[PDB]
Paper text:
To test the hypothesis that the peripheral stalk of ATP synthase deforms under strain, we next added ATP to the preparation and froze cryoEM specimens. Classification of the resulting dataset yielded maps showing six different F1 states, corresponding to the catalytic and binding dwell structures from each of the three main rotational states. Subclassification of these populations separated each catalytic and each binding state into conformations with increasing rotation of the rotor relative to subunit a, and increasingly strained peripheral stalks, designated as ‘a’, ‘b’, ‘c’, etc. Overall, 27 unique conformations were identified: State 1binding(a to d), State 1catalytic(a to h), State 2binding(a to b), State 2catalytic(a to e), State 3binding(a to c), and State 3catalytic(a to e). In contrast, the structures that show the more strained peripheral stalks appear to be calculated from images of active enzyme particles. Density for the binding dwell conformations suggests that they contain MgADP with Pi in the αβtight site, as was seen in the bacterial F1 region during ATP hydrolysis. To facilitate comparison of the ATP synthase conformations that occur during ATP hydrolysis, backbone models of the protein structure were fit flexibly into each of the 27 maps. Remarkably, the α3β3γδεc10 models from all 18 catalytic dwell conformations could be overlaid with high-fidelity (left), as could the nine α3β3γδεc10 models from binding dwell conformations (right), with some limited flexibility at the interface between F1 and the c-ring. This observation shows that, other than being in a catalytic or binding dwell conformation, the differences between the structures are mostly due to deformation of the peripheral stalk subunits and the rotation of the c-ring relative to subunit a in FO.
Author numbering:
A (entry chain I): 8 to 23, 27 to 49, 53 to 61
B (entry chain 3), H (entry chain 6), I (entry chain 9): 2 to 75
C (entry chain 2), D (entry chain 4), E (entry chain 1), F (entry chain 5), G (entry chain 0), K (entry chain 8): 1 to 75
J (entry chain 7): 1 to 73
L (entry chain Y): 1 to 37
M (entry chain H): 11 to 23, 26 to 90, 92 to 97, 99 to 115, 118 to 136
N (entry chain T): 26 to 249
O (entry chain Z): 1 to 48
Amino acid sequence: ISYAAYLNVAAQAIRSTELQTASVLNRSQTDAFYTQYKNASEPTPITK
Amino acid sequence: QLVLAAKYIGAGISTIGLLGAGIGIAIVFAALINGVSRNPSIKDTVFPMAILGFALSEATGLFCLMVSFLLLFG
Amino acid sequence: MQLVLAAKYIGAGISTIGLLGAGIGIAIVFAALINGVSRNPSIKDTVFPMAILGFALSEATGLFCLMVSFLLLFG
Amino acid sequence: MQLVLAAKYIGAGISTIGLLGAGIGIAIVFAALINGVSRNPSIKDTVFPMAILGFALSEATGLFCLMVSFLLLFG
Amino acid sequence: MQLVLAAKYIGAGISTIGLLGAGIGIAIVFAALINGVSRNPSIKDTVFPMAILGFALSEATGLFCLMVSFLLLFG
Amino acid sequence: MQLVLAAKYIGAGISTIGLLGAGIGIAIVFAALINGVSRNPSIKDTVFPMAILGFALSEATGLFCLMVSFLLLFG
Amino acid sequence: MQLVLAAKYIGAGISTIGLLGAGIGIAIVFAALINGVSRNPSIKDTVFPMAILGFALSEATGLFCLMVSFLLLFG
Amino acid sequence: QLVLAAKYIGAGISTIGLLGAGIGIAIVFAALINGVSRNPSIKDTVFPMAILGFALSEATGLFCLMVSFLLLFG
Amino acid sequence: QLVLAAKYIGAGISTIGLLGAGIGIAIVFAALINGVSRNPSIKDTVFPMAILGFALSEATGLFCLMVSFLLLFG
Amino acid sequence: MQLVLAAKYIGAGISTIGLLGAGIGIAIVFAALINGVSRNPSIKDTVFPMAILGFALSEATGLFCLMVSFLLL
Amino acid sequence: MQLVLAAKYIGAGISTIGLLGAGIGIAIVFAALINGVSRNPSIKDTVFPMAILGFALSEATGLFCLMVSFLLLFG
Amino acid sequence: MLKRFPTPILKVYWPFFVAGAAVYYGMSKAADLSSNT
Amino acid sequence: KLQFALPHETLYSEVTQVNLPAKSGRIGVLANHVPTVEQLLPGVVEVMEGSNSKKFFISGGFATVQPDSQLCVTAIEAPLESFSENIKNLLAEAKKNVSSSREAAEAAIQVEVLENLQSV
Amino acid sequence: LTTFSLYTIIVLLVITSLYTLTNNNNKIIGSRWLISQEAIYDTIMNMTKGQIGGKNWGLYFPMIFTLFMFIFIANLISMIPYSFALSAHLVFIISLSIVIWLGNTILGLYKHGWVFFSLFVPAGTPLPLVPLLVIIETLSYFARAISLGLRLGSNILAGHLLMVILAGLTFNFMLINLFTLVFGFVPLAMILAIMMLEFAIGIIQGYVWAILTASYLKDAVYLH
Amino acid sequence: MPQLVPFYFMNQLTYGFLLMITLLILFSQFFLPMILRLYVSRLFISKL
């Protein structure tokens, strides 16, 4: 497992007693998409 | 007799051999402690292997000791 | 006769060198332990059976050697 | 003579010394196996036959030494 | 008598050799201690009792060599 | 005569002592192999020939010691 | 007797051999000190009592060896 | 017959000199394998250095062997 | 005579002890260089530490040497 | 006669033991050289002279053991 | 007479064993020099006078052995 | 299973066989010296 | 000195002794300590500025002693007390579920975090 | 004539049975026994392709295979405790080693002229030790003549001598008074462990022979 | 074994070297290529 993915998940997991704040929840919960682009054209826009 | 003396002497010289085994066993166990402190989790595979490494180191010592009895009696 | 008693005391002396090896072995286990702990102090309870085990087995080889030394010496 | 017989037993005793290097040798191989394996978690499919090879070879010097000890004592 | 008395003094010297392993051994535990305390800073409270235990055990194997030396020397 | 045959046997015993240095040596090469392989993950195609070479020559020095043991022992 | 008196002069030398182990040991403690103190420049005040202790104990094994030499010489 | 006795004994003692070279060879090769594995690519420069260290360590052993032969053959 | 022979031999035996001291001195100096190179700046504190370890290592050899002289010269 | 000539042959055997140490000494210098060069890469041009100097001195000690063998003969 | 002539040669021979430790020692100081200089690229000016000092001292121990060897050989 | 295939068995492998012959002649003399004991 | 910067917050961004769980085992930095680069593993952390100590539970990050005694710690999140039992329970269930269900890597980090949290 | 002659015939007959009736008839699927000799084929094919690795790897693939199989079978048969070794006669094993070694060097000389002597300086060095590095390379080159054989011979022999001497000791263990024949399982167990080991050290030597004299052919074909 | 020094060396060696040369020819023409025949037959069905 890639290290920066490992740390990200670690932060999220640590955000999962339960006295955590909204900025924490925002810092660990988000919805996004990304798009592969030719070269131009758009090979499928796959969710993040 | 010189022969009577000789069997006692031969037992002495062979007995020194045990020294190497005393170091050897410890080197296997030391590496076990270092590995397990590094991983927290190497131990499940490694602990059977560590007992094996100990056995082999000890086994060399038993050959030396057996030579001591062959000298001492013979 | 003097030769017999001499051989007893000599054979004992010769055996005594073997003890050194087990002594070095013991030291190595504790050095490893100290390094392991400073690098990960939470290993200790899992390590504690193994630590005593490695010490004992190392030491034991020297004690086998020592028994031969006294057997020769006293006769 | 008494002297020839003495030399057989004594020569055998002297011969027994060589075994120590192989004993330490085997321990070093297993230590290295543990160390490599503790580093990778997964090198082992390549490394395990390499380690057994090192073990067998280190042991062999000790066995050669032991063989000579019997040849002097009995032979 | 001259032979056995000469044998006592020789056999004593042989036994003295066994001490060397323990001497290096003491250092090995303490070298680990010094390094370990430097890694963590504060590991020392737990570890200092472990270090004393390790020294004593290594030393004891050396002392076994010494007691054989005095048994040979005096009788 | 008695002395000469004795001396051949004694000389044989001494020769066996030489094996130990090779024994420790072989283990060092194989330890290094495992260290190297654990360091690279993939060095083995070049390095396994290098390691075999180092084993061989280290071992050979021991075998020379063994061979003198045979010459003296049988002769 | 010439044999006994000779044995003292030989035996003194044999005893002296043990002392080498402690010498190497002392160096090892100081080496660890240098490396430790290098790794955290300010660890020195805590570590330095421990370092002198490790030296003293290692040295002590050397003293015991040297005592046996003086016992043979001046007993 | 003391001289003849000593020749055979002396030959035996000579093997001990060889033992150190057996360790020595291994030490150079240990460094080689470590260096090469860390870099991959150091090897082309390093391999001449390794062979040189091996040869020099070996030569010390060669001297011991020559003395062994000098006694044995006379 | 046997006694005079024994003085010369005995002195020789004592000489073996010095080897440990030589190795010891070097180990401290090796560490000195490592410490200095590691920090770039531990050197003024580390230099007396290094000297102390050398001196003590040397001392064990010195004790062997004076015992050698005592048997050798008388 | 017999005792002295015998002693020379024994003595020759004993002298080889010193040589073993020098073999290891030389090896350590070259091992260090390889380690230094492999960590740094580029150090090699300065470091190779240092290695030769260290080698020579280690070997020289062994040479002292060897010449004593020759003296004893 | 013969016994004494033999003895002078013998005491000298035993003394050569002492020389070995200085050889290995010299290598160790130089090894550190190389390792330091390779670590820093630039420590060398500080480290070099220290290295020469350590070399000289390590060598000197072997020199003492050598002069004692000569004293025993030549008288 | 078995079949006779005309594979190389001699047109590369002569020096191995030659070395065997040299040792064979020398071993005749060695055997004769040992058969006296 | 010390910095214990977070993305939207910060926690300490001359701090005297700091105790860190690192890929070199555990590391202590005191006054001037030698300058390092260590990636911080998921951790239970103690930071001391003088004798006063603040104890932090950390998502992993990076540790970097700068040679001026500026201990740059950057981590994505890190008090210990905010994390400090029901949360551990939730992680146990989740650890189990992910254990059955990259999916491996997820289960592994979850086992680590559940333990690391249990330490708190 | 001799015992030795009888065991050379026995080795030949085992190997014929291993390649004429290790498989029921002739299959393209193979019986459970032939699965081994497929894996063996591949680990020695890929080993001398891994070693010598030329287009002449396969030209020395029969050579490396009959050196494998001879040593592999004769250190399992010889490990039957009433079987008269072919490998504990040093005079045969060392002779076989020298034969193969000479057959590498002569082949190397034939193929690569007097530029074969360029092998003995692989790389330049300062000129006062250029001749030195030719002499103590050639010395190490024909130390290969005896090293390969004496390793194997000593290993196999040491196993047999250990067993016979230990058989004599375990007899005398029972001649020691009956209180020693309470908890007397340990000397039997020592021989059992040695017997487990003795097959292993016999198969390891058969592989080690065949990799080292692949390495020697690697050196001889591809110089320096 | 207690006794393992023949004097029958040339006798031993005659039968010994006969077995080595025999196995080389035997492998090369018979037993090694009959395994390669299995390989090539399997591969020929695979390739078609």
